[PDB]
Symmetry: C3
Subunit: 240 residues, 3 copies
Amino acid sequence: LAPVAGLDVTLSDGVFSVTINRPDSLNSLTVPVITGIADAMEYAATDPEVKVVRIGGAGRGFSSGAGISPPDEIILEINRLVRAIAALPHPVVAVVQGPAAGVGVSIALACDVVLASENAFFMLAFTKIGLMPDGGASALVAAAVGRIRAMQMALLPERLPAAEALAWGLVTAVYPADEFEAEVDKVIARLLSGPAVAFAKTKLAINAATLTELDPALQREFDGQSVLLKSPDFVEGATA
Amino acid sequence: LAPVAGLDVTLSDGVFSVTINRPDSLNSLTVPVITGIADAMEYAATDPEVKVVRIGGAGRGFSSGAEIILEINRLVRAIAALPHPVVAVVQGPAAGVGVSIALACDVVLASENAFFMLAFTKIGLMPDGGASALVAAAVGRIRAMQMALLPERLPAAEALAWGLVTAVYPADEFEAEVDKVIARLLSGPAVAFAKTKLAINAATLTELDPALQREFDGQSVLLKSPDFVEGATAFQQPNFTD
Amino acid sequence: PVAGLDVTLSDGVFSVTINRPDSLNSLTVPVITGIADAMEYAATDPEVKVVRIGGAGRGFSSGAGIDEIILEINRLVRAIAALPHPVVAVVQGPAAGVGVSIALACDVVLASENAFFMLAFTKIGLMPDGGASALVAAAVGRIRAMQMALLPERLPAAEALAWGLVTAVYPADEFEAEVDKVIARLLSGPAVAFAKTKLAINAATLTELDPALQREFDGQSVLLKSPDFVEGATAFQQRRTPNFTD
């Protein structure tokens, strides 16, 4: 597997771990990073040494989203990345220690388990800069919290705090910020000692029932974002 | 756009507003005025100076609800397909299809004072307006059955906790908070909002159109059945047997 | 006529009560076959207006006792979803594994404050069956379904109400009387509006129930005849931590 700058990928004791490490950019994502994540997830599905996956961010925040600083390519890699999380025949754990915004939220909600810090908030930032949701957020969000709440995060984006995310059913768990790394470790270890084949078949089955709209949604997002990206309102969006 | 008795429609500042004005019926619905809402929503879909749509009711209540089915269905598909944010403004009770109209919208803003009730079943009918899908899509299947089979006035605050409503305000802050939200929408990117709303609807409302059809087929039968007669009558002044 | 299972019709009220209190209303194949047959019977019979499932004594059902088991689970679950009457689950205590699936296939779920829910399958090396891969998410959404399934915990009634998983919670000492009120109110309601209401919501929300049941069959078939299952059931029998290796 090829190494990628701003991204640490390690496999230890069946825990495939993928950490985005651009702590100066608040873990914003660039095409070659999105691409390495996609590659790693696709890789993880093929390696019989993998039992549990974990994706997270170093520093203060999980990810600020796609780097706001050819255009269709970013959308295609983001889509290829989400498909790969959703297909992966193991438990995927998103470790959300700080803020997650735009695509960061989508990546996390493509995952199977979402572990939040009291610190963390979530924001579907896209309309703030003249874009629409990406990475399947058109389905992934509503698949967890329902329609009205999805519509709300997307048209009236706001820093949704962890405690509220959990009460909406958007995250699996919230730990106090001083206990977070320890509680996350206990979750990974419980999963690591679980029935690997039953976990695989359970994750795939819930996803086949709850994500029948993922692919259609990725097709629309590609169609829609691709116009919005090459459009005037977004040039203004990125300026401010 | 033809003016319609019992309905006010305005295009001020890029804000398309539609208000049911029959505060004596508690904003009850008829063919002519349903038809009007429907026409106006279809109008607002292509008028290139519209940015945000707004449905609401005069006075105390939002709408107390009810051929009539078909025009309701046309109304609902028009909300769902409108390529702008449509906002439900619910200052007081919303009953029957009134609930369905509000839930078809994309943002539901509610007063401390507001209440939602799907009480078709009390009078021998089934839910309408796509409620057999719109409710579940927001709050899931178990809560949806509860409202349909065990109807109860659902105060705004619980509705919010469930997640069928976007926001609840105190009666005395209500209109001001509503206008901040509208104003917030007006400031936003109009094409990105249109694609966002339509994308989210395509993911969540795949069962809405078939639901409109099954409802039409079902009410049709139930509307010309004893249990409706008996149920309509016992509200006027029930013993159901079908 | 089935051992461990009482079926009764009253004044339009078809009760179905598992009676293996000793094992917390465990489910054998004969008995699963029974509830299934009973649910199918109740769709034909014009005297039936409301249907209640429950289990005797402390528990509701601890699920499958511890292949045809799955085919019949599936039959049962389809029979409940297809039933043109309100079907009520009366949960006075623990619900585990397919016990939960059965509850969640119902239309109305009434719980005691004593009750809890747990998708146990995974503690013993199985996947969710009985449509649980569709039915749980259909009520509470994907993140929560996945949590219950991958990190099973005893989810107490009251937290199940907040999630949207059940219709109502009652204090234990008030539970039986309250169930009765809800049953009677439904008895008094219009039967055909109810039937159509039920089926319309089911048809909008359970679009994936059938595909789920199929996947669950193909998946459990493999898992039940695997080494992780024996390790799990044994370890549960022994009140012991399992060591999985598959």
